[PDB]
Amino acid sequence: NTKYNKEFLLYLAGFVDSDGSIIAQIKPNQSVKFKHRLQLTFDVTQKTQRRWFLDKLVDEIGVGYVADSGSVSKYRLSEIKPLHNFLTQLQPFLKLKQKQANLVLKIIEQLPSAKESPDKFLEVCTWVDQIAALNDSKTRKTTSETVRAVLDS
Amino acid sequence: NTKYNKEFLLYLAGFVDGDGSIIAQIKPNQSGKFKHKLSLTFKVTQKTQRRWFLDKLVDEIGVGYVYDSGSVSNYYLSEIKPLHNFLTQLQPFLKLKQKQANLVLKIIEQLPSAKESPDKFLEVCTWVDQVAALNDSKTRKTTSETVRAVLDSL
DNA sequence: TCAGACTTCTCCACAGGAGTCAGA
DNA sequence: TCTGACTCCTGTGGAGAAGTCTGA
Ligand SMILES: [Ca+2]
Ligand SMILES: [Ca+2]
Ligand SMILES: [Ca+2]
Ligand SMILES: [Ca+2]
């Protein structure tokens, strides 16, 4: 639970609203109770010639990782606890992605009670649909409906 | 001269380093001294669905305009005095585009003089080249060498 | 003549997902 | 059982130019 400098957070929020992404996903999984698991991700993308900027970001946030894919690189953070802490601090400064952040925070807090009632799980999956609805989603496959079809069994 | 709030400049700098562009151009221009007209632009691009976000910038910066192009909108500020004023205050907070901003400010200032000798003008054109070089430039046509071509000829 | 309002074009550099896998 | 690290892909939503056309 580290506390970030407020000027760092204001600049970072602007950069995230622009080149970043707050992502919620339902991923198929045979070994889990409801055959699906959730994955939340904070993401900043940038051409690989500017990877250094993403490197500095790892050091500043103090967690996460950079990966390369083609001519582009990404800072990523999916680890639940640090993510919940980070977004909680960034959230008030976000303008375009404030809702996505809030939905992700809500999802994380409900994670525990979501792995019990199939009905509660679906509810949380609906929060996921809402994040995707807010994003510029274009290649999405697995939704809360997908989960339903599967639960009906 | 409008003064801007600091927390505003901090967030905007981040957003500009992300979705923004600081652009220097040499444009043709028959009805002109050296047949090339200089043009500077600060710009922010966004899907037209989020045009409101750009509309607000017009109000917060206090000048500039929003226009549409396909599925996308842009905030633009080209007017030289306010551009100078705005970039001077933003520049301190920029991370990826700080050098482009300083070059634009440098060009704006050395402008009146750059319209004296074909050399002073041409030297400022090389400042334009640097901006483009620092940008992810892909569809550029007119450079300082395009200028030297029209000057070393006449 | 001229800066400044306004339009068009092109090539990515993002965003926003889909997955596989290995060690908890 | 399950999560978090890591890779790969699509389809734009950007960026970074290129231009035309007034008015004073
Ligand atoms: Ca963006
Ligand atoms: Ca959407
Ligand atoms: Ca960018
Ligand atoms: Ca470059």
Numbering used by the authors:
A (entry chain A): 2 to 154
B (entry chain B): 2 to 155
Provide excerpts from the study.
I-CreI is a homodimeric member of LHEs family, which recognizes and cleaves a 22 bp pseudo-palindromic target (5′- CAAAACGTCGTGAGACAGTTTG -3′). Each I-CreI monomer binds its own DNA target region generating the catalytic centre at the dimer interface. This region contains two catalytic aspartic acids (D20, one per each monomer). The aspartic side chains participate in the cleavage of the DNA strands along the minor groove, resulting in the hydrolysis of specific phosphodiester bonds upon the coordination of three divalent metal ions.
To broaden our analysis, we also studied the I-CreI heterodimeric variant I-CreI_3115 (Y33G/Q38K/Q44K/R68Y/R70S/D75N/I77Y/I132V-G19S/Y33V/Q38R/S40Q/Q44D/R68A/R70S/D75K/I77R). This mutant was generated using the methodology previously described, and is able to recognize and cleave the human HBB (Haemoglobin beta subunit) gene (I-CreI_3115_target, Fig. 1c upper sequence) whose mutations cause sickle cell anaemia. To understand the molecular mechanism that inhibits cleavage when a G is at −4 position flanked by a pyrimidine at position −5, we solved the crystal structures of the cleavable and the corresponding non-cleavable variant targets in the presence of catalytic (Mg2+) and non-catalytic (Ca2+) cations. The MST measurements were then performed keeping constant the fluorescently labelled proteins and titrating the corresponding target DNAs in the presence of the non-catalytic cation Ca2+ (10 mM). This metal ion allows binding but hinders catalysis. To check this point, we analysed a superimposition of the crystal structures of both I-CreI variants bound to their target DNA sequences in the non-cleaved state.
